């Protein structure tokens, strides 16, 4: 799974049961990437 770091904005690939921490800067607030599922809006 790919988590974008909060402050350095670099993608981190971590597995399950691993602590949340950035590989580069050590910052531990990370966000999920946008989904690859097909998103569709009526332009309304």
């Amino acid at each position: 799974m790919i988590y974008i770091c909060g402050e350095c904005h670099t993608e981190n690939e971590i597995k399950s049961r691993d602590p949340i921490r950035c590989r580069e800067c050590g910052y531990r607030i990370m966000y999920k990437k946008r989904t690859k599922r097909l998103v569709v809006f009526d332009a309304r």
């Binding site: 599922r37 097909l38 998103v39 569709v40 809006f41 009526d42 309304r44």
Partner: protein
């Protein structure tokens, strides 16, 4: 694979008759309570539809000639109780045919392809053979559309 009826209680175990006609000793935690199907229907040797609490006679199998009341029902076996029988407190099991009366679309992303919702993308929350509930990505509603108007993305 096997269900049973408790025929005797003990301090730390039970004696339970299986579907096959044998009474075995199993522990208290060794069994889980089964949701009883009181409304099951079975077929006898002459296609009379037998039910629970019906008075039936057994004309085949090990207990042939006996008469009892239906308590519990399963695929091909019938569980009976008879007050004259001293075995298992009157508990015994016979075949149903030995008696005589005395979805793959749910969770799939989908696109409406016909009708006034054509082009809308949704997720099928609930599906039947005729209609499917499509939870629409574009609005705040779950519509009900027939599956002939739906194509799977």
């Amino acid at each position: 694979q096997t269900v049973g009826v408790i025929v005797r209680l003990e301090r730390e175990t039970f004696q339970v008759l299986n579907m096959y006609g044998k009474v075995v000793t199993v522990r208290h935690q060794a069994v889980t309570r089964k949701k009883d199907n009181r409304f099951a229907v079975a077929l006898d040797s002459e296609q009379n539809n037998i039910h629970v609490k019906d008075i039936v006679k057994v004309i085949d199998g090990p207990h042939s000639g006996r008469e009892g009341e239906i308590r519990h029902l399963f695929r091909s076996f019938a569980f009976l109780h008879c007050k004259k029988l001293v075995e298992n407190g009157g508990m015994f099991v016979c075949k149903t045919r030995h008696l005589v009366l005395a979805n793959e679309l749910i969770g799939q992303t989908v696109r409406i392809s016909q009708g006034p919702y054509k082009g809308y993308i949704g997720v099928v929350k609930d599906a039947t053979e005729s209609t499917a509930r499509v939870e629409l990505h574009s609005t705040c509603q779950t519509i009900s559309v027939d599956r002939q108007r739906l194509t799977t993305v």
